[PDB]
Design a protein around this ligand. Structure first.
Ligand code: BEF
Ligand SMILES: [Cl-]
Ligand SMILES: [Mn+2]
Length: 128
């Protein structure tokens, strides 16, 4: 993928945003911005130019499933890749996120190799 691809990393725990940002930096992606919940995320996304979203689920103000549904329903961003990265591991959560249009899903705790693989799986799927 294009190393200037602009990522939005969304999680309500600063520790996880930091992990994801650093993993992206290792992979060669330095154009990375953070958001703390779905509302903060949508404000950032309205500024434009984003190419990929990595998102948590359990967050205040607007949770990640609602963020994913908002993105998918909005004509300005409906094709934005969205990777869910969440501690929710139950199959009903996976099914609900998948059905809502998640580009991929990673269960916390996750390894560096898992995130790279799942990112690459999405890049390949979308011809990026
Ligand atoms: F709070 Be996230 F869903 F891990
Ligand atoms: Cl998978
Ligand atoms: Mn959370």
């Amino acid at each position: 993928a294009d190393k200037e691809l602009k990522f939005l990393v969304v999680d309500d725990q600063s520790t996880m945003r930091r992990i994801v940002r650093n993993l992206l930096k290792e992979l060669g992606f330095n154009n990375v911005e953070e958001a703390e919940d779905g509302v903060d995320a949508l404000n950032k996304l309205q500024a434009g130019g984003y190419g990929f979203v990595i998102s948590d689920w359990k967050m205040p103000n607007m949770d990640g499933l609602e963020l994913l549904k908002t993105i998918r329903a909005d004509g300005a961003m409906s094709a934005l890749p969205v990777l869910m990265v969440t501690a929710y591991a139950k199959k009903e959560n996976i099914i609900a996120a998948a059905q809502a249009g998640a580009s991929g899903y990673v269960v916390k705790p996750f390894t560096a190799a898992t995130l790279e693989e799942k990112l690459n799986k999405i890049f390949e799927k979308l011809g990026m």
